[PDB]
Symmetry: D2
Subunit: 328 residues, 4 copies
C-alpha cells in the first residue's frame, strides 16, 4: 500500500514535502486538511508516502541521510515537523544545467562521481520520482525524465520545464506506459492566482484595469536563481525572509465616469510549503495511474495541480475530473 518516492533536488520544496508527510502521518482520513484534496487519496493515505531515494549535487547534501539533507546548505523553509533518520542516503546526480552562476557561487559541488540514475531508481524500486530542479534546468530535467521512463517510474515535474506539456515528451511517456503529472506545480494561494482573481473581478464588474505592478521579494535559492502597462517578476532577494515570499501588488483602474479606483495589497506566504500539499496529491495520482498501467500525462491531475498542463481546463472542472479519476 506504500508509494515509493524518490526526490530529485533536496531543496526547500523537498524539505516541505518530507516534513509534510511527517506532519500529517497520523491524520484522520475523514477529516479535511488544508492543501490536500484528501488525507487518503484513493487507497493512499499521506503516511503511505515513503521516501526511498534522493539525488542532489551539493557537497553538503550528497552522502547525507535525507533527514539531514533537507535542513542542509541553503535550505531555510519553516520547520513544521521533526524528521527522524530515514536511512536513505542522498546520491550524486549529474549536474548538467541544474546549477547556474548564482548557485555555483553559493554552494560547492560534491566530489562524488554522478551515479547511474536509471540503475539507482530500479535498485530502490521507485514508484514516483518528483523533480525539484532549479528553474532553467532543461537538460537536467529532461535527463531525469528520461531515466524515469527507462526505469518505469512515474514522473512528477514540479518546475517550469515543458515535458508533460510537450507533445513529444507526452508521447515518450505514453509509449512506455509510464505516467507523468507535470510542468510547474501549483501553489495554493500565490501571487499569480491572487492577481488573476482580482484582475477578473475588475473585468467582470466593468472596471478597466489600466496599470498593474507586482513586486516579489524572497530569501531562498529558488528566488536567487530566478533573478539570474504591466509589470511582474522577481524583484529583490532579501536574505532574512528565508523561504518566505512577499508580493506587493497594485492595480489601478477606471470605473464609471473614468473615476480612479485602486487596489494595493501585500501577500505573505511561505513559498515552498505552499506547494507541498499539491505535490502530495500529484504523487498519489501518479501512483494510481501506475497501478492501472496507464501511461502518458495524467490529464485531470495535471490540469488541476500544475500551472502548465498538457490540456487547459477550468479548475473546478479539472477538479471534478480528478475526483472521478480517483474513484476510477
Amino acid at each position: 500500500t506504500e508509494v515509493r518516492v524518490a526526490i530529485v533536488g533536496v531543496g526547500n520544496c523537498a524539505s516541505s514535502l518530507v516534513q509534510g508527510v511527517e506532519y500529517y502521518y497520523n491524520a484522520d482520513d475523514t477529516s479535511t486538511v488544508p492543501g490536500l484534496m484528501h488525507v487518503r487519496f484513493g487507497p493512499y493515505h499521506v503516511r503511505d508516502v515513503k521516501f526511498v531515494a534522493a539525488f542532489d549535487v551539493d557537497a553538503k547534501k550528497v552522502g547525507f541521510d535525507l533527514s539531514d539533507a533537507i535542513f542542509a546548505s541553503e535550505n531555510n523553509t519553516i520547520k513544521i515537523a521533526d524528521v527522524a533518520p530515514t536511512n536513505v542516503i542522498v546520491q550524486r546526480g549529474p549536474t548538467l544545467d541544474g546549477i547556474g552562476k548564482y548557485y555555483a557561487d553559493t554552494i560547492e559541488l560534491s566530489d562524488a562521481e554522478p551515479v547511474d540514475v536509471v540503475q539507482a531508481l530500479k535498485e530502490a524500486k521507485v514508484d514516483v520520482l518528483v523533480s525539484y530542479l532549479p528553474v532553467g534546468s532543461e537538460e537536467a530535467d529532461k535527463f531525469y525524465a528520461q531515466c524515469a521512463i527507462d526505469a518505469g517510474v512515474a514522473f512528477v515535474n514540479a518546475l517550469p520545464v515543458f515535458i508533460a506539456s510537450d507533445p513529444v515528451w507526452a508521447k515518450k511517456f505514453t509509449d512506455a506506459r509510464v505516467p507523468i503529472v507535470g510542468d510547474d506545480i501549483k501553489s495554493q494561494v500565490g501571487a499569480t492566482i491572487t492577481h488573476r482573481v482580482l484582475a477578473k473581478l475588475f473585468e467582470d464588474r466593468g472596471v478597466q484595469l489600466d496599470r498593474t505592478m507586482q513586486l516579489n521579494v524572497g530569501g531562498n535559492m529558488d528566488f536567487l536563481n530566478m533573478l539570474e502597462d504591466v509589470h511582474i517578476g522577481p524583484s529583490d532577494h532579501v536574505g532574512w525572509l528565508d523561504d518566505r515570499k512577499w508580493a506587493y501588488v497594485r492595480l489601478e483602474g477606471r470605473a464609471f465616469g473614468d473615476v480612479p479606483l485602486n487596489l494595493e495589497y501585500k501577500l505573505e506566504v511561505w513559498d515552498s510549503p505552499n506547494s507541498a500539499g499539491v505535490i502530495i496529491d500529484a504523487v498519489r495520482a501518479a501512483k494510481i495511474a501506475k497501478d492501472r498501467g496507464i501511461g502518458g500525462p495524467v490529464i485531470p491531475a495535471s490540469a488541476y495541480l500544475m500551472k502548465s498542463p498538457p490540456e487547459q481546463l477550468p479548475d473546478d472542472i479539472a477538479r471534478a475530473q480528478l475526483e472521478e479519476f480517483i474513484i476510477g
Copy 2:
C-alpha cells in the same frame, strides 16, 4: 424615447447620477463604457435619461435647481462633468425618519411645507423614481415607495430598506402593475465584493481563513450616518476624504501544515460614482418593464444590480437573464 426620472434625496449618489448622464450624453452605443452594461439599454441611450423632478429636506437644496442642489450642502463627490441649469426645482418632501441625529446636527431642514408627493409625481409625468434616502429611513422609503405605486411610477430602491425583497411590498407593486428594482444598489468594485472574492479564493484553494478584519473610512454623510473571528463595518469618518472610501482589509489563514498565509490590502474608491452606472442600468430596466406593463420586482435586474434582491442568483446567470429581458 425619454426616461422621465425623479430623484428622492439629492445627495452624493444623486450628484454622480446627474453628472454621469451628462458625462456619457454623447457616448457611442457600439462602444463599452465602464460601469454600464450598455450605452444603449434596450431602446434607451444614457442621454434618454431626463431628470424631471427631485425631492429633499435640506434648506440648501429645496427650492434650488437640481443642477445646483447636487453640489450643495455636504455633497462632496468627485466632479466629472459640468451640469447646466435643468429648470427642475427641488421640492420639499416629508422628512419622516430620513434625518438622524448626526444629519440633523449637520444640516438645517427647509422651512417649506412638505408637498403632496403623489400629485408632484403625476404632474411631472415621472416614469421612474430613484430613492437615495439615508440608511435607516424605513418609514420614509416605504412612504416614497407607496407614492410611486399610487402614481404608477416605477421605483428603484437604492438603500438597504427591504421593499422589493419583502414579499408584502413585492405584491403591492405587482398588484398595481408598477415595476420595482431594488433593495441596496450594488457598487462595481467595493469592499464587500472584493472580500467575498478573496475569501472564496482561500476556500477554493484549501487555505483556512482563521481571522479577518475590515476597516472602512470615508468623509461623506452616508458614512457619517452609518456610524450612528470576523470584523467589519464603518470605522471612522475622515473629513478630507470627502466622498472617497478607503477599505483596509486583512485576511489571516493557514495553508498546508498549518503554515501562516496572510493577505492585507487597501481598496480606494470614490463611493458614490461606484454605483452611478449601476443605477443608470436599473433605471432603464425599470423603464422597459413599465413599457411592457409588467409590475412587481424586475427579477433579472434586481438579481444583477442589487445586493438584496427578491431572489438570489449567481451574477453571471442573473446577468444573462437580464440580457434576455432587455431583448424581450
Copy 3:
C-alpha cells in the same frame, strides 16, 4: 532594598508590569534591556520591585491572587512570563467613575464592600502606588491619589487625568512630602511619537503637510473604553487583535513645485507591554524621591516618562536630567 508596589486597576498594563518584573528578574545590571533606562535604576534592580497590594472592582479579580487576576476577565495581553502565586489578594476598591457604560456591560462588579484604601495602603507598607484606572476616571484617580498622599505613598499616574500636571495637586503632594510621577505614561514607540517624528521630518525638509489621517484599531478594554486637515483617534474595536494596537497612518504633502509626496504606514504594537518598561523606570524614580524625602512631582522623571508632565522638556534634556537625579 525592595520597592513595595501596589496596583490600582489589574488590567492589561498591570499584567505586562507583573510579567515584566518576572521576565527580567535575573537580568544583568551591566547589560541594556529594551524599554528600560537601567536594569538597576539607582540602587533598585528590576527584581527589587515587589507587588504587595492591588485594587480592582471586577468580580473575576477581587478576592483572587494577583498572579491569577492579571490573566482574568478581559485581560488579553501577550504572555511573556509565567507568574507564580504572589499571595497578594486583590482588594475591592471604590468604583466611583472607573467603570463606563461599555465596561459595565462587559463585566460584573464585585459584590464585596469597597475597603478603606488608606488603611489598606498603610497595612501593606506600600512605597509606590501605580494607577491604571480607565481613561475618564477623574474622580477615581483623584480619590486614589488622595489616599496615596494620606498614606505617605508615592504615586505613579499612568492615565490622562491631570494630577501631577495640575498645580493644585502638585502642591498637595509637595506639602505632604509625597512624590508623584505622572499624567499619562509614555509608550516606547507608539502612533503619537511616530507621527510626531515624521511630521517634523516633513517640516524640517521643506515639505508642506497638507492632510493627515490616523486610524487606530485594537481589541482590549482600554480601546473599547476610549471609543465611548487632520484626523486622529480610536477607530474600531477588533476583537481578535486583543491587546495589540494597529495604527494606519497617511501623510499627504507638497514638495518643491507643489509636487505631491505621500507616506503611508502601519505600526503594529502590543499596546500594554509598550509601557511596562517605562512604568518600571517611573516606579523606581518615585522610590528614590521617597528615599530622599522629596515631595511633589519628580520633574525629570515626569518630563521623560510621561506625556503630560508638570513641565515640558525636550526628551534628551529630560533624559539627561533624569540620569543626574538617579546619581543624586
Copy 4:
C-alpha cells in the same frame, strides 16, 4: 544679478530644474516655498538663474533647444510648468563612461563630434556648471569638473562621484579659486532620510531593530542605470511609474520583554523634483562663493545640501552655518 548656469546631462533632474525656475519665476521673496531655503538666496532670486548652456550625448537632445531637450528621449518627470524656447542649443559633450549597457541599449548617441567643453564654457560665460551625469560616470564627472576648474566655473556635483569630498579634488578647486558644492545632491524627503529618522526613533526609544528591508521601484533611466539583517537598493524598474519612485520599507524590532514591534511603510515621491529645490539653493550658494573669490568646497552648503560632503555636520548646524554664509 544673474546666475549663468550650464547643465551637464539634460535628463529628468535637468528638466525639474529648468521647470522649477520657471515655476517660481514670480515668487514673492518674503514668502516660503517648499524645497527652497530662500526664494531669494543672498542677492539671487530664483528668476536670476539663467540657463546659458547644456551638454548631452543623446541624439534626441544634442542640437535641440534646451526647452525641448528637457522633454525628449526617456525624460519623463512630472510637468509643473511650460518652458518657452531658450535659444540655448544642447552641445555634444564627450561620452566617456556616462553611458552604460542599459543606457546604450536604450538610446542612440549623437553623431556630432564632442566639442571643446572648456572653450564652450568660456564662450557662454558660465558661472555655475551643474553635473547630472548617470551614477558610475567617474571619468566623465571628473572630466567635466576639470573643465569647470579650467574655465573658472563653479561646479555643483549632483551625483555620487567623489570630487568635493576627495581631498585631492578639493585642493584642485581651492588652488584654482573655483568653488565646488558637491557629491550627491540631497532629496527633501526620500527613502534614505525617512529610514534614518525612524531607525533613530527605535533606537532612542529603546526598541531593538532586528531586521529591516527597503524595496525601491521606479521608472526612469536613473533607476534603470542603478540596476546595472539589512536589505536595501534598487529593486525593480516599473515602466509606468516614470520618474516616480516608491519605497516599500519594513522595520522589525523588539520592545520591552522582547515583544515584537513592527512598522511597514510606503513612500511615494517624484524622484527628480525631490532635488530641484536643493539644486537651486546649491547653485546660488556656489555663485555667492564665486562672487567672493573663495575657491574649494563651500563647506556649509555641501554639508547641508549634499549626501557626501567634504565635512560631516548635523543638518541644523550645517543649516545655520549656511545661513551665516549667505549673509556673509
